[PDB]
Amino acid sequence: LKPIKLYTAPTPNGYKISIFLEVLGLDYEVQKFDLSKNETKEDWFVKLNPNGRIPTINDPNFKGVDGGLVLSQTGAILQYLADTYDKEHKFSYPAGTAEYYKTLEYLIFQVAENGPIQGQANHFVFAAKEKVPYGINRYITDTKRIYGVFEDILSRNKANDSKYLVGDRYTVADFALLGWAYRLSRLEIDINQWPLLGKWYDSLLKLPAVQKGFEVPPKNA
Amino acid sequence: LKPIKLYTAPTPNGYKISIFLEVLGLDYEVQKFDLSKNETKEDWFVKLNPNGRIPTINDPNFKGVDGGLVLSQTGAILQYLADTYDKEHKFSYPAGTAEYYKTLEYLIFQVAENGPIQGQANHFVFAAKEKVPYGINRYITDTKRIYGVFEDILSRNKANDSKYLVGDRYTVADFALLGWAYRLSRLEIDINQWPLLGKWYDSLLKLPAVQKGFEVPPKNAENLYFQ
Numbered sequence: 064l065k066p067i068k069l070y071t072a073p074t075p076n077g078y079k080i081s082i083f084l085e086v087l088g089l090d091y092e093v094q095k096f097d098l099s100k101n102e103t104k105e106d107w108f109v110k111l112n113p114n115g116r117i118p119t120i121n122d123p124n125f126k127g128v129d130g131g132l133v134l135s136q137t138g139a140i141l142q143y144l145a146d147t148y149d150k151e152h153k154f155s156y157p158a159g160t161a162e163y164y165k166t167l168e169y170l171i172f173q174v175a176e177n178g179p180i181q182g183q184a185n186h187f188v189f190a191a192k193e194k195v196p197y198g199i200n201r202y203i204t205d206t207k208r209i210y211g212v213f214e215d216i217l218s219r220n221k222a223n224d225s226k227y228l229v230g231d232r233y234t235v236a237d238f239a240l241l242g243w244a245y246r247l248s249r250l251e252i253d254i255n256q257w258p259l260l261g262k263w264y265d266s267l268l269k270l271p272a273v274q275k276g277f278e279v280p281p282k283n284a
Numbered sequence: 285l286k287p288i289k290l291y292t293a294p295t296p297n298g299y300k301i302s303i304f305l306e307v308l309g310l311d312y313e314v315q316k317f318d319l320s321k322n323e324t325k326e327d328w329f330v331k332l333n334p335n336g337r338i339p340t341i342n343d344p345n346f347k348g349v350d351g352g353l354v355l356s357q358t359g360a361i362l363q364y365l366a367d368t369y370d371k372e373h374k375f376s377y378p379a380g381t382a383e384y385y386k387t388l389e390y391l392i393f394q395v396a397e398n399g400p401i402q403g404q405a406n407h408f409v410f411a412a413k414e415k416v417p418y419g420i421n422r423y424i425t426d427t428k429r430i431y432g433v434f435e436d437i438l439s440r441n442k443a444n445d446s447k448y449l450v451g452d453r454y455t456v457a458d459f460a461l462l463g464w465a466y467r468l469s470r471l472e473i474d475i476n477q478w479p480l481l482g483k484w485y486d487s488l489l490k491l492p493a494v495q496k497g498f499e500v501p502p503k504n505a506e507n508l509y510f511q
């Protein structure tokens with residue numbers, strides 16, 4: 064198995080992929096991007112990913128494509144990794160099962176709502192050149208609404224003591240949320256206010272593969 | 285097959301599912317929600333879908349689940365319908381193939397950036413209680429960015445005259461984008477400024493199943509109101 068090529072940056076979306084690659088025990092190499100310098104909008108990278116954003120992977124083990132499968136969107140990459148590299152179903156469910164589709168539901172809920180909304184909150188709080196309270200308020204509030212939904216989802220998993228989003232194992236859904244959950248403190252939002260999510264977060268943060276994923280790439284150079 | 289129950293409203297997201305169901309030739313029954321009355325937040329519906337938004341389906345044909353499979357998120361619902369009801373691959377690619385994954389990448393791109401961003405623009409223009417120019421400008425501009433990307437994507441499918449987002453067939457990625465492309469006119473954004481999208485868009489509206497899905501639930505004087 065050849066190293067997977069990871070185009071990334073030290074961001075919640077990047078962390079999803081680096082964490083899940085560590086969890087699957089996959090070898091990989093990274094190319095690191097400086098977002099503040101608009102490097103993901105450079106021509107050569109947009110040829111790989113039209114959207115011009117990280118993360119993107121190139122898997123040279125995918126034989127049908129010359130030069131390897133190039134894939135973007137954390138939602139798609141996570142699914143691809145699970146389908147291809149977790150056939151033992153340690154972190155995923157068999158295709159076409161209810162638990163498989165519920166995984167999809169909550170993964171897509173994460174990429175379609177959690178990420179975009181918390182991202183807007185981060186923009187109005189940290190990045191925006193002007194202070195716009197309407198926006199700060201709209202996205203902080205909706206961020207809280209969404210984590211309230213995840214708290215509810217966990218509460219529904221009674222038979223496995225609300226330890227996982229779906230059934231009796233972490234799935235790509237958990238790992239996707241994990242990336243952003245890790246950034247909540249930046250908005251002065253204490254994840255412990257949602258008790259089940261607090262336990263779920265603490266559990267994941269104890270796994271060495273999670274701790275390693277959060278280190279890739281470093282916040283440094 | 286038994287009818288699939290569709291919880292929906294006349295909205296870009298609802299249309300994604302009603303259009304795809306029509307394309308797949310599946311029997312279904314509709315229950316509409318009045319969003320101005322906060323109906324998707326009622327206790328009974330939040331039990332089915334914790335997020336409290338439409339659309340949501342119930343497939344009584346799914347045999348694993350008592351009472352049928354309940355599924356939310358247009359992205360998951362689309363993937364589910366394609367997996368389950370398009371085994372002939374008329375609107376999807378075989379599981380595991382490069383084209384299958386590119387379909388997934390562009391579908392996720394739609395639900396993760398197109399919908400959320402164009403929805404914010406719609407909020408700042410039609411729904412916000414005050415005029416917030418920073419918001420209006422931010423989301424209109426980013427909406428145009430995203431359609432530009434979809435234009436680039438189409439341009440890379442030269443071998444198929446740039447008619448499809450992936451390969452030689454419409455997939456869930458196209459049908460996903462279509463629901464929201466339909467809403468560009470409200471913002472006075474002419475999709476024809478992206479000429480490949482313009483042809484792609486015009487081609488889809490010629491399909492009888494698309495025209496039908498856009499009438500589900502029906503347009504009327506009770507829902508043709510922008511604010």
Ligand SMILES: N[C@@H](CCC(=O)N[C@@H](CS)C(=O)NCC(=O)O)C(=O)O
Pocket residue numbers: 072074075076077098101103104115116117118135136137138174178396397
């Ligand atoms: N929906 C995408 C989000 C990707 C994304 O937001 N990437 C950010 C960093 S986390 C980025 O590349 N920003 C640079 C830019 O937008 O110019 C996904 O889930 O992968």
Ligand SMILES: N[C@@H](CCC(=O)N[C@@H](CS)C(=O)NCC(=O)O)C(=O)O
Pocket residue numbers: 074075076174178179180181182183186190396397
């Ligand atoms: N182009 C972005 C730059 C900042 C950015 O890329 N933020 C990422 C997170 S680092 C984001 O919000 N992603 C949203 C998502 O995951 O869908 C902006 O104008 O806000």
Ligand SMILES: N[C@@H](CCC(=O)N[C@@H](CS)C(=O)NCC(=O)O)C(=O)O
Pocket residue numbers: 175176293295296297298319322324325336337338339356357358359395399
């Ligand atoms: N990520 C969701 C978005 C769903 C969505 O935005 N539904 C809207 C109608 S299009 C809704 O139910 N709004 C009611 C509310 O939020 O109160 C999906 O793609 O299914």
Ligand SMILES: N[C@@H](CCC(=O)N[C@@H](CS)C(=O)NCC(=O)O)C(=O)O
Pocket residue numbers: 175295296297395399400401402403404407411
């Ligand atoms: N909860 C919304 C109500 C409006 C709404 O639900 N808009 C839908 C479309 S009708 C939306 O933007 N969905 C975002 C998406 O599809 O990801 C708000 O706060 O503005």
